[PDB]
RNA sequence: UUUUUUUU
RNA sequence: AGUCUUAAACACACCGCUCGUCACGUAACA
RNA sequence: UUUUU
RNA sequence: GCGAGAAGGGAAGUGUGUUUCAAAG
RNA sequence: UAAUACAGGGUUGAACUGUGGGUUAGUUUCAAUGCCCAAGGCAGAGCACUGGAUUGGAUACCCAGGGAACUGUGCUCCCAUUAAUAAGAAUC
RNA sequence: UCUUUGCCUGGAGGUUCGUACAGUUGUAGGUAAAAGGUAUGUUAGAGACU
RNA sequence: AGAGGCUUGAUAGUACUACCGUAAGUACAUAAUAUACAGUCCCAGCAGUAGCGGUUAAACUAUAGAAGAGUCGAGUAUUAUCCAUACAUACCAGGCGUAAAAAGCGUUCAUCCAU
RNA sequence: AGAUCAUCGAAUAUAACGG
RNA sequence: GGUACGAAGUCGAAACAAGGUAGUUGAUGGUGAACCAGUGGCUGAACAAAAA
RNA sequence: UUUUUU
RNA sequence: UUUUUUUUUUU
């Protein structure tokens, strides 16, 4: 009835989804795992070393570009590596006997099993910067919270139609730091709604 | 209480779908395989009939009043074609009375 | 006064934070330094996209500081076009130019930005034969070309010609 | 105002082609807005009564539900910021009576002026 | 509004309101105006045009389609396999064989019991109400009777199949407006839900929802009946609840206005001219149109170089370059060799050691 | 008394505007002009109901004062309040007369 | 509909139309809103329940402190109330006894001893936990229930190296007449920890 | 405070009571995970190793483990992706229109512009697998620089470098222009992969599948089995929950032995 | 490869 | 005697259903 | 309360 | 010399309160 | 409920009028039968009342006599309360 | 579809111009089914006929 | 069972703010039951509108009736209180045939309604 | 200084000034 | 005097269906208990019931 | 105290 | 449930 060969149509939205009797059918799905753990442990040591050696030449952003790592992911590698080494050199406790919540214990098992089947990743595979793309991220993505409407209705006419009312930013209160001392911390309360600045 | 809505659920508003529309959904849903005659009717869909009856209208019969005057002046029209069926005098298209009016 | 947490089988799984962000303005925004900053899709995650980071970066840079009626319209349009054209001496694409006529069009190109920044004329090369024609969007020519006074007059006619059919009074 | 509420009974018919309606100044303006949205095929003022045609599609009519909000005995008013809450996530048609004539609910929010909800077309709950 | 005494002594524009002198366009008023123009050109009517050649010269053509003696003289002279189960099943038994029985689901509602009086004692016969319908776009309710509860269930399901009706459901799984339903005391209000949230209803009636094919909805029963039993009235509520639903494709066709969703952009209204722009052109007639069409003098398209694309296998990821770091080259070499293996990589092994 | 959320609804705001006039002025019709330099002005007010969302009307008869005694019975006039008490009944002052009844 | 709103007096006609009364708390109305009220008994009789319920139910007319008399039921086996006895009543309706809409409270009342025989319901019968019953809840030692399966497993992988309790390693588990020893670390872990802790 | 539940206390799995049924008594049974659909991406070992030499030969992979850790490097996806590429770019392949119409069609099929990573499909400087040979798109090149460069380049790069194969094919692109060409021999080979169609084929492997009543029933249990959204949440204290598992360590084994004790003893004295 | 599966 | 039509407050279906005076006992408006 | 088997 | 009912429910129905404005002893 | 006198309502024709209205208390007429009071009588009917029937154990059923009640400008509306169970406007 | 008047909230119950005028459903001892009805059966000194 | 109060005849969908099939206390140890059985027998009782108790019913008493089958937990449970969960306290959001509800028929005052 | 619904107890209504 | 509930005895056959010779109602009269006689109104009324 | 095991 | 942080949408 209509021609639209693209991948952002109503029917093409959320491809490979159960629409019918297949919703109740059990299906296995891949297990997610953070990128900072899938990398080769060997490379983590190397990356940490560089960071700790010369932060100027080896910045947080430049270091992650060569190995293809995000600015946030590379930060955790140094932080997690530091603590592991600190307890070994100082002869405090072994990493295996370290106390940690159950959420991390299950994560460690997955990391070991991930490599035992496929293997560790020699180089990360992720983009440093994001990209505006059409994807389904939760139920709050395909909804307009400003006008609170799902279906947009407009008049059909060839002539220029009047534009819609643009929204205004929401003014909220914030706090800033002016003077900081060991025995006292002074702060300032900002009120954007005040006409007189002074 | 009971069917007290002249303008409401009393008057159904169910969409009328032909065979072309019904078959298109079943085949797509995967419930029934595509028959050999599915494409035959696709190129020549049937003509809509619901909208044709809307043009029907009722008109007033003017022969009831006009024929009264004709017989009054010339009441010798009932003799012709008297033994034939359909004619009553207590008329057929072929009757003189209908021809003149 | 609440601490949400899972209470079911799925007690350990990736739970990414989502920050819905609708369109900031429905009006058509131009490209900043040639980089488009228009919205492509409505689905936006918490992480700021590089395209949006450019618009917000430049926002903080802007400082807070800074008879008949028909006959009159044409009368003012001609006067304004002539006055503006004479200031440079003492938009549509498809403007061809010859190789040997580059100096003649170079001064005109650079002179339109001083009085009409909206002009976005382009340059198209062609076999060098002394030709200099300026075409419009609809495919109509507005200036056809066959001590220093002759050179100045040639450029004067071109500046006013484009403004005559572009200016709105 | 009373004659305005008498148009829903005539326009809300299934097995019919054209229905009459009492002539009124306010009623004429309402029909203009509905025709723009494609709800009424056409209308004609036949003197003391107005003849309005009915639109049908696949048997069923285009109009399926009519709700009268405003009544002669009272008056419903909503602020520009309150109409959005009422009307949200819907395809319905609300007739708004503003100072500058009569317009739909979509245009009322654009101007930000306080209108008056008269009637509802193709509205659910 | 507020026709008080004070308002009545101020809204009077004049002492007399001459309504008979008003100027309103009537039917006879316009008729007289046209007739006055004709100097001393009147109303006329036209009769239907009856032509015999319309059907006389066309009916003969239809005869050629059936003039054959083998198609004119004649007039005017139980099991189906179920491969994963493998057992005989009744096919017809008053049921359409065309419809697949391995794609539908049933949900038992209730099993009521009745009483019958006779000359000797009492006779009891069971009954059931089984709703059968595909969980994609179909729904149906059937009712029957039987001597025993087991037989009643089977008979009730039979009627549901034979009374299957289509629904008007959105492609996008998003309703327009909330529908409401009634029969006597009952109210069944269906509250829509956002896309990607799932269903939310009573656990008892949960299966029912699925059977309907409705996604992202909150179905609640507001007192199905306040007297007697509540199963019979409830049967008719479903029927006159889903008929009121309307999809985008319905409203847009009659509304002739923008009726698009938020995520997609102009999917149903956008109709590119695929029979005017992509029209075929041969090399034998192209030379004739070059001297007649406008010469190409424009600049608005840069990506205008494409032709018939032939499927070709490429590996952009594994492409050594002069700017890649030494570590990247090494890492890609090992990865490439693993995917090209056809002896170890494309194999499934249960145990870890070669047992 | 009205709640905080009841002071922002269109129904209450519209009623308020009708009642509210410059200098707390009022509109009413005279019903008694027997005593010298005295006229009783009957004013009509409005109120809003947050339960059924309906506005009613209730008359408010008050006494006024006239200098030239131009106003007569059945004549809509304008009144203005005052920050004192003059006479036993007099509580208002005339400004002008809008409509005049024949004799 | 909105037919009931017509008229300028809509604010005085609609609101005066009360739907119904308050079905809940309709029987217990003589308490003056108090949870409980004390009273004194002046009449003891046995009221026969209505048909088809047979048998006999013991009842007594208790005079409330507010100068009102109402019948009260005495649930539970036995009977101790007599003439001029103080008893605390509470809420509760009795279907078998017509009119009675109150119940007595055992224990807190005056001159009302504890029930005769009851173990299941403790709070209801205001019965305190007896010392004998409390001691029984602490005895938990029934783990030694070996079977033939354990015997075979023990003499396959746990008979070569196994330390006994007193002073010896090598034992004789293969003998049928002998009994396999118990675990000295896991068996009876909960009972051992509690007994060894209270001994201080 | 809120103590015990006041209601039906229906089970999480959604099963009925009665004899000859999983559940006997009414209860919640929150601890029973067996009834809940769960994946198995780990491995299980055997109870006894017959091998004399201690070795981990009893380790076996799980059925769900293969699909739990997939790898987007298998060979049988590129072939399918290549075929879909031709069918996806057909709207512009058969579009015999001007540059303006062709450019718009390609934009919708693949978003690409300034500051965005595009696939390079349709650009003048890109190699495509055309059905028949065709000349490059030399229309965008300047005419002034090419004309002046043709003389200084010399005969070496005027008739043997690029012009030797610039007119070997009958067909061409964007018309014909024998005067304007590229004397330099710069090969515009290589291409880029798409980010939309490639991600769809890769995820296709995660949805693959290998007196009776006419109409099959739909038990409630089925719904709750796979889906975890419609399942009632836990309310008991964690401490109690954890203690329940510890209790069963020594309790459970006793129940099994107590049952067989009576049956085994009965046969040894009567049977 | 750590008193890992394993549990006051 | 076997059917048809109509009525019915019964359907353990006319051995059905149901009402009133008087006699004894327990109580709230006294 | 006690505490590297 | 300065401060002190800092422990007040006895009065009132169109009142006590609320809202809109105003106040260079 | 034939004749005659007084004065209403409905249908149609002409003239005039040029928004005159729907509902209705602190309101006003009429209103079967029965009862008080009053006027009354000489016909046809009958409650109470000893006037000829009951029973298979109790009765007013079936005859006859029989002093209340049956025409009011009045006092006066209790009812199964006088032409359906809505006083108005719009869709044929 | 719209304007206005009037009326009801399961069934059910009350001490043993002045003897005038006005006015009235409601503060219980008690109860869990009163009731409209489509169809079947049965009864009928109630009508008809093999 | 680091530890006590309730239920143990049917009936009740057992709560909702992040996540919304994108995952293990996943496997061995480690699997069972209470509509088995004991006492009284229109009597003693239980209970929630409907009810059970006679010849023995998972409905009354009893858990050395078995390391109680379940829900809470250092509390649990009964009564009581209010705008008492759509018994819609009825604009949203109930009526005036038979069922609880339209004044015997009519002209007028005020208010509301109307072109 | 201006404006600013009254409700319960079943109910029982015309009152005060000058010839 | 009258009314509620429980048990249950004697004296009677009023309602159902034309047997009590139709039966509820407004106002009276009368009778150990069903209630009965007369007038008005209603059906919540049974049987019977036209050619020249 | 045993069994299993990158 | 963050070694050198009193910062951290930790999960």
Short mmCIF file of N, CA and C in Angstrom, two decimals, chain E residues 276-296, chain H residues 96-98:
data_model
loop_
_atom_site.label_atom_id
_atom_site.label_comp_id
_atom_site.label_asym_id
_atom_site.label_seq_id
_atom_site.Cartn_x
_atom_site.Cartn_y
_atom_site.Cartn_z
N UNK E 276 7.61 7.25 -11.72
CA UNK E 276 7.86 8.45 -12.51
C UNK E 276 9.35 8.78 -12.55
N UNK E 277 10.02 8.72 -11.40
CA UNK E 277 11.44 9.04 -11.32
C UNK E 277 12.29 7.84 -11.74
N UNK E 278 12.02 6.63 -11.23
CA UNK E 278 12.88 5.49 -11.58
C UNK E 278 12.51 4.85 -12.91
N UNK E 279 11.71 5.55 -13.72
CA UNK E 279 11.28 5.01 -15.00
C UNK E 279 12.48 4.47 -15.78
N UNK E 280 12.25 3.39 -16.52
CA UNK E 280 13.31 2.76 -17.30
C UNK E 280 13.70 3.63 -18.48
N UNK E 281 14.97 3.53 -18.88
CA UNK E 281 15.50 4.27 -20.02
C UNK E 281 16.48 3.38 -20.76
N UNK E 282 16.31 3.27 -22.08
CA UNK E 282 17.17 2.47 -22.92
C UNK E 282 18.16 3.36 -23.67
N UNK E 283 19.28 2.75 -24.07
CA UNK E 283 20.32 3.48 -24.79
C UNK E 283 19.92 3.82 -26.22
N UNK E 284 18.89 3.17 -26.76
CA UNK E 284 18.46 3.45 -28.12
C UNK E 284 17.69 4.76 -28.24
N UNK E 285 16.99 5.17 -27.19
CA UNK E 285 16.18 6.39 -27.21
C UNK E 285 16.74 7.49 -26.33
N UNK E 286 17.85 7.26 -25.63
CA UNK E 286 18.41 8.29 -24.76
C UNK E 286 18.99 9.46 -25.55
N UNK E 287 19.60 9.18 -26.71
CA UNK E 287 20.20 10.25 -27.51
C UNK E 287 19.18 11.25 -28.02
N UNK E 288 17.93 10.82 -28.21
CA UNK E 288 16.90 11.72 -28.73
C UNK E 288 16.44 12.74 -27.70
N UNK E 289 16.46 12.40 -26.41
CA UNK E 289 15.99 13.29 -25.36
C UNK E 289 17.07 14.23 -24.84
N UNK E 290 18.32 14.04 -25.25
CA UNK E 290 19.39 14.92 -24.78
C UNK E 290 19.25 16.31 -25.39
N UNK E 291 18.91 16.39 -26.67
CA UNK E 291 18.78 17.68 -27.35
C UNK E 291 17.44 18.36 -27.08
N UNK E 292 16.50 17.68 -26.42
CA UNK E 292 15.19 18.25 -26.13
C UNK E 292 15.00 18.64 -24.68
N UNK E 293 15.70 17.99 -23.75
CA UNK E 293 15.57 18.29 -22.34
C UNK E 293 16.51 19.43 -21.94
N UNK E 294 16.26 19.99 -20.77
CA UNK E 294 17.09 21.08 -20.28
C UNK E 294 18.51 20.58 -20.03
N UNK E 295 19.54 21.35 -20.42
CA UNK E 295 20.91 20.91 -20.17
C UNK E 295 21.19 20.84 -18.69
N UNK E 296 22.06 19.92 -18.25
CA UNK E 296 22.35 19.80 -16.81
C UNK E 296 23.30 20.90 -16.35
N UNK H 96 16.61 6.42 -12.02
CA UNK H 96 17.11 7.16 -13.18
C UNK H 96 16.64 8.62 -13.11
N UNK H 97 17.07 9.29 -12.06
CA UNK H 97 16.73 10.69 -11.80
C UNK H 97 18.01 11.51 -11.69
N UNK H 98 17.86 12.78 -11.35
CA UNK H 98 18.98 13.68 -11.21
C UNK H 98 19.71 13.48 -9.90
#
